[PDB]
Structures are given as C-alpha cells and as structure tokens.
C-alpha cells in the first residue's frame, strides 16, 4: 500500500503524541501517552513517549511504509526517546526538523504563574 | 373477601352465588348442593 510517510512527534510537558501520515498529510495512524493509559507525571516522561511512538509505527508498519523523515514540535522531555523508538521498530529515518511555532511578534501571552 | 359462583360438575354450569375470603380459602371451593336440572344433589366447583 503506502510508502514514505512522515512522523509528527508533538511533545508537551504533559502528554506526547505521534501521528504518522503519508506525504500528503493523510493520517495513517496515531497514538500517544495518555491513550496507553498513563496518568499524570507518568504521562509526560520519556518512557511513555517510547511506548507511544511504537504502538503507532507498528500499526502503520503494517501498510508497508518504511521511511519517514520526522518533524518535531514542542519543548518536550520525551521528544528524543521517540526517535529511538521509531528507528528501532524498523522504519529508517531520513532527516529531521524542529518545526515549532515562532511569532515574529504577534499576539500576547498569558500571565505567568505565581 | 370476594364473590364466587358455584357451577355444577356434571349438569354443566351456574346454580348458586356465594362469598369467600381468598386469604383463608385460596383454592376453589367444593360443596354438594341441589342441581335442579338433574333433580339431584351433586358437587359444585367454584367457577
């Protein structure tokens, strides 16, 4: 079926999410730390981002994609463990990118917490 | 405490009308009374 997608890792300080698409943004399969049933402060950590990044690939492994070129987003504790989960499960990374949103000074941000 | 009808067992059907308490006699009552079609005492079941 499909070959050559891209992986969209999306880690925040709670919860990472990995979604694999084709190269037309077509959403082969997704998964993520809280789906596996991790509760908070575990939900966040580098173990769970390497579960979640391999309950994905192995369930779109199965469409014969095998080459992905990742793009990364967020700050994240568990960003980079999700790219030895990937390249572990047989997918052969091509080359990566940190596409995070950066205002060229736009809207105003929330207060900060005391 | 209800109303009951005594029907003949062979001469066929209703002859008498009585009353009963269905907490003390929950079954069907049995009494020998005069069937005037047979001209003879027979047995009467409550309908």
């Amino acid at each position: 079926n499909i070959e050559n997608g891209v992986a969209h890792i999306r880690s925040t300080f709670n919860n990472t999410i990995v979604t694999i698409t084709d190269e037309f943004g077509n959403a082969l399969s997704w998964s993520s730390a809280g789906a596996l049933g991790f509760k908070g402060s575990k939900k966040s950590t580098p173990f769970a981002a390497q579960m979640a990044s391999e309950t994905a690939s192995k369930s779109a492994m199965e469409h014969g994609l095998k080459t992905v070129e990742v793009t990364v987003k967020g700050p994240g504790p568990g960003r980079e463990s999700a790219i030895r989960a990937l390249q572990s499960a047989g997918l052969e990374v091509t080359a990566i990118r940190d596409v995070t949103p950066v205002p060229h000074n736009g809207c105003r941000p929330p207060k900060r917490r005391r | 405490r209800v109303n009951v009808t005594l029907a003949c067992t062979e001469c066929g059907d209703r002859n008498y009308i009585t009353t009963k308490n269905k907490r003390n006699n929950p079954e069907r009552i049995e009494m020998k009374k005069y069937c005037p079609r047979l001209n003879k005492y027979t047995l009467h079941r409550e309908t």
């Binding site: 580098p46 173990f47 390497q50 990364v72 994240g76 504790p77 568990g78 960003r79 980079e80 463990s81 030895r84 990566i96 990118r97 940190d98 | 907490r23 929950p26 079954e27 069907r28």
Partner: protein
C-alpha cells in the same frame, strides 16, 4: 407472525398474578423476557407450553422433580442416536442419574434435549445458569446460528447485550416491548424515570403554593370575624366576600389532587448486614493429604487447603471440577482416604448452597426460619420483612416458591446464624439485576472470612484476595508465580532510558 397472545389474565394456579397481559412473537426472532424475581417469568413460559398452541421446547430451570430418571432416557423423553458426536457441550456421560450431575452439567443436558426437539418455538429459561466462562462464550455463538424463534429469560446483562432482538419487560401491568439490546432498553428506562419525578416534584410545588395562599386567607378571616359587628350588613358582606376568596381556591386545590395523582414509590435504599464473632485464632480449616472419589471419579488426590482468620477465598475451575464437593468436605462428607480434614473445634458456619438442600420442602416460610434454636416470632417475622416478604407470604410451602425467592430465603437464615465464615456457593446466580447489587454490598460489609464460588467476572474482580484453583486433581494458589515470570531483562532495557536526563533534553537542539 408466529404467535399472538390475546389479552387474558395470567395466573399459575389458584392465585392470579397479572391481568391484561398480551404480546406477539414474530418468526425467526430471539426475544428476551426480563423482569423482577417472583413476577411470573417462568409461569408464563409454562402456560405457552401446556395450554397454548403450536408445539414448543420448554427447557426448565430446576430439574428437581425428575432427579432419579436415568440420563440418556431423559434426553429421549420425546421419542441411530446422534448424541456421542454432539459432545460440543462436553457433557460427561449418560449412565448416571440426573440428580447426580454437577449443578451446571445439567444445564447442558437440558439444553441438549431442547435443541434436538425440532419444534417451531423454543421456550428457554435462564440458560446461562451455572455455566463457565468458556461454556458461556460458546452458546453466544450457538444462539446466533438457528433460524428458529426463541423466548428466553436471562437477567444477565452481559449475555443480554449480544443475543436478543427485542426485550419483553413484565411488570404486573403487562409486557412492554423494547427494541435492541440491554443497553438500548436501559437508556429509555432512564428517560422514563426522570419524567415521573420531575412530574411529581412539580405537583408538590404546585399544591403547596395553593395551601399557603389558602392558609393566608384564613388568618385574615378569623381576625376580621371578631372585629365585625354582627349588626352591620356592610361589614358582614365584606366578610362573606373574603370567604369566597379561599373557598374557590380550595376548589382549585381539590381538582389538582383528584385529577393529578402519581408517586415515586420504588424509593427505598435500605441494605442488609451480618455480624461475625471475631474468631481470635489463626487457622479456620485445613486439609492433610485429603482424597475423595465418586465411585469411579477421582476428584481430589492428596492435597492441602487452608483458610486463616479474616480472609476471602475465591475457588475457581470449571464445570465438574469439584467446587461444590469441596464445600461439602468442610461441613461433612467423611473422606475415603485418611485425609483428616482438620477443622477448628469452635466454628460457626453460614452455608449458601447451589441446590436448596438447606431448605426443608413441605415447610411454610414462617415455620422454617423459626426452626432455629431460640428465635422468637416478632424478631423472626420482622427480619423476614425487609427481605421483601410482604406479611402475607407467611403461609406458603417452601416447595412452591420462586427461584429468586428461596435464594433470598437462605439469606434470611444467614442473618440469624452469626457465623465465623460465610460459605457462599453461587450467591448471585438466581438474583435479578437489582438484587445483585444489594448482596454484593452485603458480602463486602461482612468483617469475617468467606469462601466464594462464582462464575461472574465483574463480582470476583475487585475482591480478589486469595484464589485457589483445581487444575488436575489438586488445589493451587495465587502465590505460584511459575506461570508467567516478569522476565527481568529490564536491567538491560532501563539503561538506555536512564540517560535522557531532564537537562540533557534542555540541550541538544534538533
């Protein structure tokens, strides 16, 4: 249109149960018939069998009257023989009696006789009665196989979610047909209970406001009737005009009451309890290389078994393993081997049996509970109520009660037997959906020890403390971690994840 039930009163016997009962049953349809315990779900099934038209099947749910009939001629009660190759049920053998089977091995020698009957409509009772988790996942695949019409009584809300095409809910008002599974029935019965309490809460708040306006007119009146001269026609006339004010809002109040009348009557959240005797020792019972055998069958070889103070034991296995015969060794069965079932000399026991061999048939309800040692009549009749015995079921022979009742009657004898342990054998099996919760709280609010034998997963799932089991001829435990080790190679695997620090992430931009 396979069958119509024209409107007629239902009644098993001299007593009348329902009036104005009617329903239809199509062809090729499986129709569930759910309802409360003691309402008449089984008497209605007997009616269609005996007194009705087209021939049927009528798989009963007691099999107690016929207990010495040799099996393999009970199966041939209707009639080279296609039975040996029909052991998909895994029925043991056809040389025993039929009162000598397991409790759940005769719920599939009556399901065998029902499928091989070749009738248009099959009248089935409980049929997931007593069955395992594997023999109950097999007939879910069997009921979805035959093009005949079925009309069964289930009250099992896991079986009821796949099999039925509609649900027939007996109420004592008649049968109200629903469509879909149990979850579609349940949703609409919830929307139907909101409207009756919003409608009741809205009649109380409309009738209390008319009482308070009425009461205010009357405080004005008796204060004005002492001030008014009896020899003044103006002041009297204002007095009779004030009475018209409240006399006509009493007529508005009397047309709301004699016209707007309902109740929220099924609102009593009471619950039961039992109190133990605080054993004060370590071991309750014990086995010492015990063995047993039913004349050819070797149930237990030399095994060990123990229950300590304040424990909860859950015995497992399958149909025929020996659960209800292990519970017999604890009270008395006199082992053929030495064995020497080692029991404490000061034990009280509360026994709940699969077959009602505790209860004395041909014995009224009131005079059976009163058979205990020093029970009085007030505290007996008063505990007999609160178990829903409405002070008129006092003179009924135990031989002619329901199945849900008399599973509730051996719980009203447990209350008057303050035990050290409760030996419950299938305690939530004949109970309807609403009573399975009132006795799951009871088993949990008992501060003693209990041995539970049960086949439903969502009752023995949150109470799992100790779990023995009967695999070959011997009991096992849950401290046998021989089945599945954790395979501690994590030492090699939680060393890569050790190096993603909290500050290593801070560096190493991507």
């Amino acid at each position: 249109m396979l069958f119509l039930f024209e409107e007629k009163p239902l009644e098993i016997e001299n007593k009348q149960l329902i009036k104005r009962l009617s329903f239809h049953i199509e062809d090729h349809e499986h129709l569930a018939l759910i309802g409360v315990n003691g309402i008449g779900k089984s008497t209605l099934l007997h009616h269609i069998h005996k007194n009705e038209l087209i021939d049927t099947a009528m798989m009963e749910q007691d099999l107690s009257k016929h207990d010495d009939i040799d099996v393999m001629d009970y199966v041939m009660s209707a009639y080279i023989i296609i039975e040996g190759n029909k052991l998909g049920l895994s029925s043991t053998h056809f040389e025993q009696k039929i009162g000598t089977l397991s409790g759940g091995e005769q719920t599939k020698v009556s399901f065998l006789k029902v499928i091989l009957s070749d009738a248009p409509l099959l009248l089935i009772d409980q049929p997931t009665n007593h069955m395992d988790k594997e023999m109950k996942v097999w007939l879910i695949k069997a009921f979805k196989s035959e093009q005949r019409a079925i009309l069964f009584v289930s009250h099992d809300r896991e079986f009821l979610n796949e099999t039925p095409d509609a649900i027939l809910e007996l109420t004592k008002d008649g049968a109200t047909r629903y469509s879909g599974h149990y979850d579609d029935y349940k949703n609409q019965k919830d929307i139907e209970i909101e409207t009756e309490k919003l409608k009741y809460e809205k009649e109380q708040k409309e009738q209390k406001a008319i009482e308070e306006s009425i009461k205010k007119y009357k405080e004005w009146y008796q204060r004005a009737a002492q001030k008014a001269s009896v020899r003044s026609p103006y002041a009297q006339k204002q007095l009779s005009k004030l009475a018209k004010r409240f006399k006509s809002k009493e007529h508005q109040l009397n047309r709301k009451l004699e016209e707007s009348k309902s109740d929220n009557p099924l609102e009593e959240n009471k619950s039961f309890s039992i109190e133990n005797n605080e054993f004060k020792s370590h071991y309750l019972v014990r086995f010492e290389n015990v063995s047993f055998s039913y004349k050819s069958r070797e149930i237990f070889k030399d095994t060990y078994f123990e229950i300590k103070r304040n424990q909860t034991v859950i015995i497992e296995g399958k149909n025929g393993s020996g659960k209800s015969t292990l519970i017999q060794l604890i009270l008395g069965n006199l082992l053929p081997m030495s064995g020497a079932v080692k029991k404490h000399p000061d034990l009280d026991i509360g026994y709940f049996s699969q077959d009602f061999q505790n209860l004395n048939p041909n014995n009224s309800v009131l005079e059976e509970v009163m058979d205990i040692e020093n029970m009085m009549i007030t505290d007996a009749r008063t505990i007999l109520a609160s178990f829903y015995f409405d002070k008129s079921r006092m003179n009924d022979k135990v031989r002619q009660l329901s199945m849900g009742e008399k599973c509730r009657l051996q719980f009203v004898k447990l209350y008057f037997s303050n035990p050290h342990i409760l030996i419950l054998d299938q305690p939530t099996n004949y109970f309807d959906i609403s009573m399975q919760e009132k006795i799951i709280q009871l088993i949990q609010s008992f501060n003693g020890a209990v041995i539970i034998v049960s086949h439903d997963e969502i009752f023995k799932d949150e109470i799992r403390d100790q779990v023995w089991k009967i695999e070959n001829c011997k009991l096992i435990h849950e401290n046998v971690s021989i089945n599945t080790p954790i395979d501690a190679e994590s030492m090699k695997d939680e060393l890569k994840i050790l190096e993603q620090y909290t500050d290593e992430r801070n560096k190493e931009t991507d």
